[PDB]
Design a protein around this ligand. Structure first.
Ligand SMILES: NC(=O)c1ccc[n+]([C@@H]2O[C@H](COP(=O)([O-])OP(=O)(O)OC[C@H]3O[C@@H](n4cnc5c(N)ncnc54)[C@H](O)[C@@H]3O)[C@@H](O)[C@H]2O)c1
Lengths: 116, 629, 625
C-alpha cells in the first residue's frame, strides 16, 4: 500500500491492483482494473451528468458495459507484490462512498483542456 | 579576467592593472580618426577584431552602455529543425574540414549516428590550430555515448529494433576502449591549450553547474530574469552554432527546462504581486517556443500550465512559430506518411513534435498552416505516441486560439470516416489513454458546427447491415453527424425493451428525449427496486432534477436512496444525510443547475463552507467559487 | 595466472591509470605487421658484398662493411628500396595505444606506431631527430630513439650501422637523455624485444650504474615461442627486469607470434577495470584504499561517495547503496555482508580486520547503512556537531583564545574567526596554516580565497554603501591589510588550485575538487528543482500520497550539505547560493507540510536554518501561503 495515492479532486484512489469480481448475472471477469478520467470540461449531452468517466479493462483489454454493472469485489491482487489487498479494498470502498473507490490510474483532462 | 563582459554586450574593467586595452579599443572603434593612425597590418587586425566583437555581440564598456538591443539570433540549421536542408547539406560534397564538422553535427541531429561517428573519425584523421580536431574528438566521444545509451534503451525497450549493427557496435567499442575524455585537452599541443583554454569545459562531464546554480536568483522574493534568459541564449548559440553534440544531452535539456520554468514562474509571481499591490510579464517569442518544444517533455509543459497562467503569456513572432509548427508537421508526414522512419532520429524528434503541437494551443495558426498541422496530427502521428484520445486532446487544444474552420472540420470528418471504415474488422478497436474516442471528435465537430451533417458517415450507416455490428455501434456515438435518413436507419438496430437497453442508448446517445414509455420503464424499475428493498437510482434522481423526466410520479420512491431524495425534493431532503463528495461527481452543468435551483443552495453552501474550513480542499473551494453552490 | 604475473599486471594497469606508463616498443611489434626484419637487410648486404648469405655483432658489422665499401649512396639505396613499403598497423599497436601510455619509446624506423597514433586519434609529438626534442609541440613524446625516415629514406637519419651505435651517445645526446629521463620517471614495458637484444642489454648496463633502489624495474613482455629457462629468468630479473612470459601465459605454436603478443596485450587491457579482488581480504583492502583518505574530513556527503567509487554504486541520502556501474565484483555488497555476519569478520586477517573496523566506523558515522534490497525502517537523526552552526559565539571565542594543539585546531579556529566576523585574523590564521602544512592545506587555500572574497565584498559595500547605511565611513580593514591581501590573492586562481596538487591527492580527494566552485551545489540544486516541480504538481492535482514523503529526499540532502559544510569548517556555509538553496529546500518542506496538515514539525534545526538562511520577506511569504 506504499504506492496507494488518494486523488481528492475525484475522491478516489490510484492503486496498482487488479480485481476479480462477480456481477449481478454470475459472470466472472479476471484480472480486471478500472481507469478513471476526470473530465469536467467534456462536451456533455442532455443526459450526461457525471464529471469523470470510468473504463474497465480485463486481461489488458477494455470492456463494453452494455448491462447494469452492479458488481462485488471477490479478490484484489497487487502487481508489485502479489499480496491480496482485498480487505483493504472493501474498507476503502466503504469509507469512500463513491463509485469505484480504487482505480488503476486517474487521467486528469482539465489541465490539457483549452478552456483550462 | 582582465575584463568582465556583460550578457547584454558591454565590458567592465576588473582585475586589470596595466593599460586599458579594451577601453582603448572601444575608443578607437568609435572614432575612425584615431583608427587612421594604426599601421596597415594593425589596421587589418583591428578590422578583424571589430568583426569578431560585433559578431559576438560585444558593444562597448559599461559607461558607454545605452539603448542595447539584445536580440537572440542562433544561426544554425539544427536549431530551427531544417531537416531537409540538413540532408541536402550532408548530400553535397564538403569543400573543407569545417563543412565536414558541420556535416557530422547534422548527421548526429538526424539520427544517423553511425555516419556521424565515421565522419568524426575521418575529421580527426585529416585534422592533425587543432581546434576542429579537439572539437571532433569531443563530439565523437559524445556520439559514442549517445550510441551506447540508445543501444541500452532499445535493448530495454515497442518493437525490437537494431539501428546499429553489432559489427559496428563492436568496432566502436574497440576504438573507444579505455578512451579518456579528461586527458583530451592536456594531451594537446601547449599552444592549443594556451589559445583555446575556453574549450576546456567541453571535455567535462558537467558544464552547466554555474548556470544552473545561478537560477536561484529567479526564486527570490524581495534584472535577474534578463540575465538568466541571455545566459541561456548564449549557451544555446554557442552549443548550436559551433556544432557541439552535447547540446542534445540530458544535462542541457534539463538546464533549459529549469531556466525556462523558473523564468515563467518568476514572471507569474511578479504578476500576482503587482496585482496584489497596484490592484490591476514574460513575453514569449519564436526562440522561446522552439526551446520549450524541443527541451520540454509533455509533463514539464503540463507543470508549467498548472503552476502559472500561461494564457497570460503573450506569444510573439507567431508567424515564425507557425512556420516551425508547419515544418514539424511536414517532418512527421515524411517520417510516417512515407517509409523513411529513422528509429534513432524518430526517438528524439517525436518528443519535440509532441511538445510543439501541445504548446501550439497558445499560438494563432493560419488557416492553411492550421490545416497542415491538423492533418499531420490526426493522420500521420504514430499511434505508439499519440493514441486516439491523446490525438483528440491535441486537436481540441488547437481550437482555443483558432475557431474550428470549415477546412479543419472537413479534415476531422475525413478522420472520422477513416476511423469508421477501420471498423469493418471485428477485432480492430480504438485504444485511448485519455478515455476519449472518435465520438469525442464528432462531439467537437457538432460543438463548432451544430448543424453540420457528415455525408460519408451517413452513407456508411446507409450501407450497414445486421452483420457488422461493430460499425453499427460505432456510428451510434456519431449519431448527430448523421443525416435524418441515416439516423432512422441506425435507430432500428437497437431495442429499448428493458431498462438496461435504455441506459445503453442514453450513454451512447441513441435517445436524447425521454418518451413517456421511457418514463414508464424507469418507473417500473423504481417499483421493482422498492419492492426488493426489503446504481441508476441517482441517475434517475438527477434526470428528474435535470428536467429530463416530467413523469411527476417518481416521488413514490423517496426514502431509501439519499441522492434520489436529495434530487427529487431538495426542500424536503434531510441534509444531515447529504454527502459532500456528491459535488465532486457532478459536472459543470449539474453543479450550476444545483446552485441555481434557488432551493437547497444554502445547504450546499454551508456544506461547502464546512469542507473548505475543515480540509482546505481546492476542489471544494473551486466548486464553491465557480458556481457558488 | 602466476602471482608475480598478476602483480605485474596490477602495476602496469595502475601506471596506465595514473598516466605514468611508457611503452618501449621494439622491432618485434613492427615485424608483427610483416615489416621487414633487420636480418633481411643484413642478409641482402651480405649477398651484395659476398657471393650469398647473423650474429649480434654481424648485425652492425655487415651494414658497416657495406657502407665503407659500396658507398653511402649504395647503402642508402638498399635501405630505401627495402623500407619504402607501406604496411598496415597491427591490432597490437592499437592495444598499446589503448593502454594509454604517457610516452612510446621505440627503436623502429617505421611509421607504423605513427600511423596507429594518427588513426586512433592520439596526438604524440614525434621525436626522431635531435632538433625534434626542443620543438616538441606537446608534452607526450613518441620517441624514435634510433631515428626514422620522415626526413628521408637516408642512412644518416637512422641508427643501423655499427658506427651509428658506437657514436650514439655523441650523435643523439638530447634523444638519449630524454629516453633515460622517461625511463627513470615512468613505468616502462618492453614489447617486441628479445631478452638478448642489443638495446635491452645496453639499457640494463646503464641501469646497473644507478642507485640500488632509485628506479623502478621495467616490465619486459617476452613473446618468444618457448618458455624462458629458469636460469635466464633468474639472471635477467636480477638485472632489473620484471619479465611477463607469453609462452608461460598460454599454449601456442612455434611461429604464431601475433597470438603470443595478443595474449599479453588483451590480458593487460581487460585487467584495466578489473579490481583484482576475489577474497574478502582483497575487497576490504580496496575499500580501505578508497575510504582512508576521507578519514581526514569530519563528514562526507553521501551523494559525494559515488565519485569516490567511480560511479560503481549509488549512495542514496537515506543510507542505502545500489549497484550502478560495477560490472566487476560487488565489493560493497560483500562489505555489508561482512558487516552483518560477525562470524565472518574473524575470518579476515589482523590488519584486514582493523581496516574493516575503521571502515565500519566511517560508514556508520556517515549514515551509509546497506544496499537497497536489505533496507528496512531507515530513520536517522540529523545532528550537526558544530559550534558555528549552533551560534556558540562565546564558546567559539573561548576556543579561539586557546592554544592550537594541532593544525586541525588551527583550521577550526580560522573557521570560527570567519564566523565571528574577524576576517583579518581568520585570513592570517589560514595563511599560517598554509605555511605550516594535504587535505587541510587544500581546504585552507579554498577557505582563504573565500575569506578574501568576503573581505573584498565587505570593503566594497562599506565604501560604496557602508557610509550611507551606517551614516559613517567604517574601516574594519586597514588599507595596509587590504593591499597585502590584494597582492597575495591577485596571483591566486581557485579554478587551477586542485590541479596544482600531487596527482595522488587528486586521486584520493577528488570529491573535494567541487569545493572550488558552486559545482558542489549542482547535483542537489538540480534535484531540488525537480522535486519542487513534482511536489507542486501533486499539490496542484490534490493527490495525497501514502507512505514515504516525496520531500524527505530534499530534507536529507539539505542536512547532508549542512553537515558537510559546517562540520568540515568550510566558509561556503556563508555563500549566497548556499543560502538560497537552503531557503528553497526549507520553503518546499514547509509548503508540503502545510498541504499535508490540511489533508512534519518544525524542530530546533529547522528553526535555526530558517533564521539563518531566510530573509524577513521569505518568512513573510511563507506565513502568507
Ligand atoms: N640471422 C637471423 O637472425 C635470421 C635470419 C632469417 C630468419 N631468422 C629467423 O626468423 C625469425 C626472425 O626473428 P629474429 O630471430 O630476428 O627474432 P629475435 O629473437 O631477433 O627477436 C626477438 C623478438 O622479436 C619478436 N619476433 C621474433 N620473430 C618474430 C616474427 N616472425 N614476427 C613477429 N615478431 C617476432 C619476438 O617477439 C621477440 O621478442 C626468427 O625466428 C629467426 O630465427 C633469423
Amino acid at each position: 500500500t506504499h504506492d496507494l495515492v488518494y486523488h481528492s479532486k475525484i475522491n478516489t484512489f490510484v492503486w496498482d491492483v487488479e480485481f476479480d469480481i462477480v456481477l449481478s448475472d454470475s459472470k466472472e471477469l479476471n484480472k480486471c482494473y478500472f481507469v478513471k478520467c476526470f473530465n469536467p470540461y467534456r462536451i456533455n449531452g442532455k443526459c450526461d451528468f457525471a464529471v469523470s468517466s470510468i473504463d474497465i479493462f480485463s486481461e489488458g483489454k477494455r470492456l463494453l458495459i452494455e448491462n447494469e454493472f452492479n458488481f462485488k469485489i471477490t479478490k484484489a491482487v497487487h502487481v508489485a507484490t502479489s499480496k491480496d489487498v482485498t480487505e483493504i479494498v472493501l474498507h476503502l470502498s466503504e469509507r469512500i462512498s463513491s463509485p469505484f473507490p480504487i482505480v488503476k490510474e486517474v487521467v486528469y483532462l482539465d489541465w490539457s483542456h483549452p478552456q483550462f | 579576467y582582465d575584463y568582465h563582459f556583460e550578457v547584454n554586450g558591454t565590458v567592465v574593467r576588473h582585475k586589470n592593472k596595466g593599460f586599458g586595452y579594451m577601453e582603448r579599443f572601444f575608443e578607437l572603434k568609435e572614432s575612425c580618426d584615431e583608427r587612421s593612425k594604426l599601421s596597415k597590418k594593425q589596421y587589418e587586425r583591428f578590422n578583424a577584431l571589430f568583426n569578431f566583437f560585433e559578431k559576438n555581440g560585444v558593444i562597448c564598456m559599461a559607461k558607454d552602455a545605452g539603448t542595447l538591443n539584445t536580440s537572440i539570433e542562433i544561426n544554425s540549421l539544427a536549431y530551427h529543425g531544417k531537416y531537409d536542408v540538413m540532408k541536402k547539406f550532408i548530400e553535397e560534397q564538403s569543400v573543407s574540414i569545417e563543412d565536414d564538422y558541420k556535416k557530422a553535427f547534422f548527421l548526429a541531429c538526424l539520427g544517423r549516428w553511425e555516419e556521424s561517428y565515421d565522419l568524426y573519425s575521418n575529421i580527426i584523421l585529416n585534422s592533425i590550430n587543432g581546434c576542429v580536431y579537439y572539437l571532433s574528438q569531443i563530439n565523437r566521444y559524445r556520439i559514442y555515448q549517445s550510441i551506447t545509451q540508445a543501444v541500452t534503451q532499445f535493448n530495454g525497450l515497442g518493437r525490437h529494433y537494431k539501428p546499429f549493427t553489432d559489427e559496428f557496435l563492436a568496432r566502436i567499442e574497440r576504438e573507444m576502449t579505455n578512451f579518456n575524455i579528461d586527458d583530451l585537452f592536456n594531451g594537446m599541443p601547449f599552444e592549443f591549450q594556451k589559445k583555446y583554454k575556453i574549450l576546456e569545459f567541453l571535455s567535462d562531464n558537467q558544464f552547466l553547474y554555474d548556470d544552473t546554480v545561478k537560477l536561484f536568483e529567479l526564486t527570490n522574493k524581495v534584472s535577474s530574469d534578463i540575465v538568466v534568459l541571455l545566459r541561456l541564449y548564449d549557451n544555446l548559440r554557442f552549443l548550436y552554432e559551433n556544432c557541439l553534440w552535447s547540446v542534445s544531452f540530458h544535462e542541457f535539456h534539463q538546464y533549459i527546462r529549469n531556466s525556462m520554468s523558473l523564468l515563467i514562474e518568476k514572471a507569474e509571481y511578479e504578476r500576482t504581486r503587482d496585482i496584489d499591490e497596484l490592484g490591476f510579464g514574460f513575453f514569449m517569442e519564436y526562440y522561446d517556443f522552439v526551446n520549450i518544444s524541443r527541451h520540454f517533455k509533455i509533463d514539464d509543459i503540463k507543470n508549467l500550465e498548472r503552476s502559472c497562467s500561461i494564457d497570460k503569456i503573450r506569444f510573439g513572432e507567431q508567424e515564425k512559430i507557425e512556420e516551425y509548427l508547419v515544418g514539424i508537421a511536414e517532418e512527421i508526414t515524411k517520417q510516417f506518411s512515407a517509409n523513411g522512419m529513422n528509429v534513432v532520429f524518430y526517438t528524439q524528434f517525436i518528443s519535440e513534435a509532441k511538445a510543439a503541437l501541445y504548446f501550439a494551443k497558445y499560438v494563432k495558426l493560419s488557416e492553411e498552416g492550421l490545416g497542415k498541422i491538423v492533418k499531420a496530427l490526426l493522420f500521420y502521428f504514430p499511434e505508439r505516441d499519440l493514441d486516439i484520445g491523446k490525438r483528440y486532446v491535441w486537436l481540441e487544444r488547437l481550437t482555443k486560439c483558432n475557431e474550428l474552420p470549415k477546412s479543419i472540420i472537413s479534415i476531422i470528418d475525413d478522420f472520422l470516416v477513416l476511423q469508421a471504415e477501420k471498423h469493418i474488422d471485428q477485432n480492430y478497436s480504438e485504444v485511448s489513454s485519455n478515455g476519449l474516442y472518435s465520438r469525442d471528435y464528432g462531439a467537437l465537430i457538432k460543438h463548432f458546427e451544430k448543424n453540420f451533417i457528415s455525408k460519408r458517415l451517413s452513407e456508411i450507416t446507409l450501407c450497414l447491415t445486421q452483420d457488422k455490428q461493430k460499425q453499427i455501434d460505432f456510428l451510434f456515438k456519431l449519431l448527430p453527424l448523421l443525416s435524418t435518413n441515416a439516423k432512422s436507419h441506425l435507430l432500428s438496430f437497437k431495442s429499448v425493451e428493458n431498462i438496461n437497453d435504455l441506459m445503453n442508448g442514453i450513454r451512447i446517445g441513441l435517445i436524447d428525449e425521454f418518451t413517456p414509455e421511457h418514463e414508464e420503464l424507469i418507473i417500473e424499475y423504481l417499483e421493482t427496486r422498492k419492492v426488493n428493498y426489503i446504481d441508476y437510482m441517482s441517475t434517475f434522481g438527477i434526470w428528474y432534477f435535470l428536467e429530463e423526466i416530467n413523469n411527476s410520479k417518481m416521488e413514490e420512491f423517496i426514502g431509501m436512496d439519499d441522492q434520489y431524495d436529495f434530487f427529487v425534493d431538495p426542500e424536503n431532503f434531510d441534509y444531515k444525510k447529504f454527502i459532500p463528495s456528491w459535488l465532486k461527481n457532478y459536472n459543470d452543468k449539474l453543479l450550476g443547475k444545483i446552485a441555481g435551483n434557488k432551493h437547497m443552495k444554502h445547504h450546499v453552501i454551508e456544506v461547502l463552507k464546512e469542507r473548505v474550513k475543515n480540509s482546505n480542499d481546492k476542489r471544494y473551494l473551486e466548486i464553491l467559487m465557480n458556481y457558488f453552490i | 595466472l602466476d602471482n608475480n604475473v598478476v602483480e605485474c599486471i596490477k602495476e602496469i594497469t595502475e601506471s596506465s591509470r595514473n598516466g605514468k606508463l611508457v611503452f618501449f616498443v621494439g622491432a618485434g611489434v613492427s615485424t608483427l605487421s610483416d615489416y621487414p626484419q633487420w636480418w633481411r637487410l643484413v642478409d641482402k648486404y651480405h649477398e651484395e658484398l659476398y657471393g650469398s648469405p647473423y650474429s649480434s655483432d654481424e648485425y652492425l658489422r655487415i651494414p658497416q662493411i657495406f657502407y665503407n665499401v659500396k658507398g653511402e649512396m649504395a647503402f642508402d639505396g638498399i635501405l630505401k628500396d627495402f623500407f619504402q613499403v607501406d604496411k598496415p598497423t597491427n591490432p597490437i599497436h592499437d592495444k598499446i595505444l589503448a593502454m594509454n601510455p604517457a610516452h612510446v619509446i621505440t627503436t623502429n624506423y617505421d611509421n607504423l606506431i605513427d600511423t596507429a597514433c594518427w588513426k586512433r586519434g592520439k596526438y604524440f609529438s614525434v621525436i626522431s631527430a635531435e632538433e625534434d626534442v626542443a620543438n616538441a609541440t606537446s608534452s607526450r613524446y613518441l620517441l624514435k630513439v634510433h631515428g626514422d625516415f620522415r626526413k628521408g629514406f637516408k642512412g644518416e637519419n637512422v641508427v643501423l650501422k655499427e658506427d651509428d651505435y658506437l657514436n650514439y651517445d655523441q650523435n643523439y645526446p638530447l634523444i638519449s637523455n630524454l629516453m633515460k629521463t622517461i625511463i627513470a620517471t615512468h613505468t616502462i614495458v618492453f614489447i617486441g624485444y628479445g631478452l638478448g637484444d642489443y638495446n635491452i642489454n645496453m639499457l640494463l648496463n646503464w641501469v646497473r650504474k644507478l642507485q640500488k633502489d632509485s628506479f623502478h624495474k621495467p616490465f619486459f613482455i617476452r613473446t618468444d615461442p618457448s618458455p624462458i629457462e629458469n636460469e635466464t629468468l633468474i639472471y635477467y630479473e636480477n638485472k632489473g627486469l620484471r619479465i611477463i612470459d607469453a609462452a608461460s601465459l598460454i599454449d601456442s605454436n612455434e611461429y604464431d607470434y601475433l597470438e603470443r603478443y595478443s595474449a599479453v596485450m588483451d590480458l593487460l587491457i581487460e585487467s584495466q577495470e578489473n579490481k583484482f579482488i576475489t577474497k574478502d581480504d582483497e575487497v576490504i583492502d580496496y575499500i580501505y584504499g578508497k575510504i582512508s583518505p576521507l578519514f581526514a574530513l569530519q563528514y562526507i556527503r553521501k551523494i559525494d561517495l559515488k565519485h569516490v567509487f567511480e560511479y560503481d554504486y549509488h549512495f542514496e541520502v537515506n543510507g542505502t547503496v545500489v549497484r550502478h556501474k560495477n560490472k566487476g565484483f560487488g565489493y560493497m555488497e560483500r562489505f555489508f555482508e561482512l558487516k552483518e555476519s560477525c562470524d565472518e569478520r574473524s575470518k579476515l586477517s589482523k590488519k584486514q580486520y582493523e581496516r574493516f573496523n575503521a571502515l565500519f566506523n566511517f560508514f556508520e558515522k556517515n549514515g551509509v547503512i546497506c544496499m537497497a534490497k536489505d533496507a528496512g525502517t531507515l530513520n536517522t537523526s540529523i545532528e550537526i556537531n558544530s559550534l558555528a552552526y549552533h551560534g556558540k559565539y562565546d564558546v567559539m571565542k573561548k576556543f579561539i583564545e586557546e592554544q592550537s594543539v594541532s593544525i586541525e585546531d588551527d583550521y577550526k579556529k580560522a573557521f570560527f574567526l570567519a564566523c565571528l566576523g574577524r576576517w583579518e585574523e581568520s585570513y592570517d590564521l589560514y595563511s599560517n596554516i598554509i605555511l605550516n602544512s594535504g587535505c587541510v592545506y587544500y581546504l585552507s587555500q579554498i577557505n582563504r580565497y573565500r575569506i578574501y572574497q568576503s573581505i573584498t565584498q565587505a570593503v566594497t559595500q562599506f565604501n560604496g554603501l557602508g557610509l550611507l547605511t551606517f551614516g559613517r565611513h567604517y574601516k574594519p580593514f586597514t588599507d595596509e591589510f587590504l593591499a597585502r591581501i590584494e597582492r597575495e590573492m591577485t596571483n591566486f586562481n581557485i579554478d587551477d588550485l586542485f590541479n596544482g596538487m600531487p596527482f595522488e591527492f587528486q586521486k584520493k580527494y577528488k570529491i573535494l575538487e567541487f569545493l572550488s566552485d558552486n559545482q558542489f551545489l549542482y547535483d542537489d540544486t538540480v534535484k531540488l528543482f525537480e522535486l519542487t516541480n513534482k511536489v507542486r504538481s501533486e499539490m496542484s492535482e490534490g493527490s495525497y500520497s501514502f507512505g514515504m514523503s516525496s520531500d524527505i529526499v530534499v530534507l536529507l540532502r539539505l542536512y547532508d550539505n549542512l553537515r558537510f559544510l559546517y562540520e568540515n569548517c568550510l566558509w561556503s556555509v556563508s555563500f549566497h547560493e548556499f543560502h538560497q538553496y537552503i531557503r528553497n529546500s526549507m520553503s518546499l518542506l514547509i509548503e508540503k507540510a502545510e498541504y499535508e496538515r490540511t489533508r512534519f514539525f518544525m524542530e530546533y534545526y529547522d528553526f535555526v536554518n530558517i533564521s539563518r538562511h531566510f530573509k524577513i520577506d521569505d518568512i513573510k511569504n511563507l506565513e502568507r501561503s
